[PDB]
Subunit: 163 residues, 6 copies
């Protein structure tokens, strides 16, 4: 397991899973290529009634209507396809492991969505995969896509050394 | 909030809470003055039947019989008063926040025990408080004892920026 | 306030102010996209008569005729629009706070110029804003453009927690 | 020049100057052996009328009456010889370089006091020099006492690579 | 000498030598622009008979037939010009200093090859030099190309402060 | 394997091997308790005729007559039992792996001496083992004494992931 690495801003390499360990109910990461892909993940603690919360994403101050009816944490993918388009909750990962993953591969961005321990992967298209950089607000790990089933196991069951 | 700080080994200052954010089911920290105080905390994931697990603590390979009948994580304080005495589970913090705290103050070591969100503080005596250093295996924070009620709130309810 | 961060080389995100705290009379930062924008800032201590000083900028050894008739520090923006064009002092920030700022936004690079506490912002055009990376030689901070008035206050009056 | 090093807590080695570069008007460092020596340095920006400001020092919340009638920064050594004794401004370094130095040597703690560029060294006695650790709140450097005249030059004239 | 810097992933600036100090017989670095340039260097310890070893490069699991008949270490440049083309050992640096260098300059990637202390530089062409980033698995240094003869001296004779 | 860790100054925990990877012909580490134990290791490159070289050790400027008639590196333990006693070459580790080890255990300091791949351990006595801190000038690792045979294998054969 490569990591843990402290919060930083960098352009992740293609074909590597970025496994982020969220530690608070704020902005988990900000990922964009500044042309056609903007994704910021906000973490919602369990049992949150519909509320407007303010988040700083991509240098802007945005308001999101968020909620969480579950016992688990919810990580909301806020997406827009242009700097002028409005953010919307495109995907959600409901998790008690607090692990979030993002991968650049095959001209697409891959993340985990659904509910642990049965979260699965999905893709978003982009015309500029190379320029996708990320601002990671928490500790994170780097896993080669050749070991994705290990990343899948971490996303759904958490980081465990003992069985 | 002072932090987060990456895992390290140092002698913590007196009158400051060390708030450690555990991220796996291994050794959370190792604290000793090498004279009359040894404490290592091991993290047990939820729903673990009685099992013998091996841990490396203070350079030695030790076997502990651990269990967890709860939905929450259990952080087991393994204590001995001399390098020849046997470790025993002195205290336990049952938590879903995965936050562990240790403080050097008033000639004593203070930690949090019980079950969140109602965990409380306890003390252990020592004749050498100054030589107590720690090996921290996870991200951690530093909180002055003047802000202990904030540390108490984090231990019991987790790190939250939004309300 | 995001920081402080140790000296590093990275591609700063768009819409964030990079606030750099200079600590010596050398190269403060080097910023280029390798196509049409090169800016290196050199710091001149107070009361420097006209003198030729040598600086390593973008891997090259360059000589600049610098001076400072003021009681304050002078941060000289040395700019060229191509790797073959000659550097020239395009802008100057005269400051006693030793804080320098650079922002990528709206297809332009923004910096602070003038004299504290009345320094203002200016822009430089570029056809490739995304590829602008920076080599920062000192501690620096990251401020969202939504909080630029706070960055303006720091540039002109320094970092103050107490009023 | 050894450094710069990011803020940390450690036990400095004997016979080395710790040269700290203050960056705000807060607590610069906290140094104690927990037996007979407590020193915390607070930084006062220029032109401050007599005012009560609150500082967190050694985990406690203390109020200090501070002032600065000068154009330069003032670094106030707040000292007490026991955890029950009251802090008092024992020494002051008036500086425009914002560099502060502390040295453990010959059974004593040495710092710089006076006004730059003519600041000189002074000593404080202690019965336990080995247990003196420090919480450094800013970037700092390490200089062997064999090169103290270089540390003296930095304290009084600042860090300069060019002449 | 700029460094040492801990292992990281970043886009190196043009006109700077990246001098990497290998510390094990694994992947030294991975460099690609994701369009027409892939180079991963694997380190072979002395006296290795022809053997198939597995390496994780660019997130993929690859098998390389490697050997080393020499008393010195061999650093094998495994290159491909497209994600579908097969890796092949394009160049080799036989060294007892364990120092490896890569430079982006003049639209080309430059490395050191041959046998120390007479290793020389070579170039590889690319249509996208700006997007070449690197995953460095060991401590590394940064040297301006204006001081390449110093980098040459390090590559061939090692890092020496004393003569 | 715990590490690598960047150069730092700290008090190593008892019962852990500190495995230091030397990268130049200078001071490898400085270890003392300031009462009865001083050890600084200097690295001598291969084929050095008898020469006086200057080293900064424990803040003092000292001259050592060093030599190396071997093809391998020599790491010289310069020891004194008091701040007034003269340094002398107490032990030497002749190595082509450039790995140096120091351990605090059983009231003694343990290091590796001899010639790789047959270097063995030795002990030095001290009345104050707890106050022994170290200034490490290179990357280093931490190995529990329960895994000393692994540390022995690294000291004598180097860090190898592949067989
Ligand atoms: Na979709
Ligand atoms: Na008890
Ligand atoms: Na202009
Ligand atoms: Na006095
Ligand atoms: Na060729
Ligand atoms: Na002996």
């Amino acid at each position: 397991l490569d990591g843990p690495y402290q919060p930083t801003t960098f352009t992740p390499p293609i074909d590597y899973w970025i496994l982020i360990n969220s530690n608070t109910n704020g902005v988990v990461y900000e990922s964009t290529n500044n042309s056609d892909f903007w994704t910021a993940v906000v973490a919602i603690e369990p049992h949150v009634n519909p509320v407007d919360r303010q988040y700083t994403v991509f240098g802007e101050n945005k308001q999101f209507n968020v909620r969480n009816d579950s016992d688990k944490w919810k990580f909301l993918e806020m997406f827009r396809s242009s700097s002028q388009n409005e953010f919307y909750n495109r995907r959600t990962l409901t998790s008690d492991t607090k692990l979030v993953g993002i991968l650049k591969y095959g001209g697409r961005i891959w993340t985990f969505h659904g509910e642990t321990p049965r979260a699965t992967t999905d893709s978003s298209n982009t015309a500029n995969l190379n320029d996708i950089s990320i601002i990671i607000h928490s500790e994170f790990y780097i896993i080669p896509r050749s070991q994705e089933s290990k990343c899948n196991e971490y996303i759904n069951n958490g980081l465990l050394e003992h069985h």
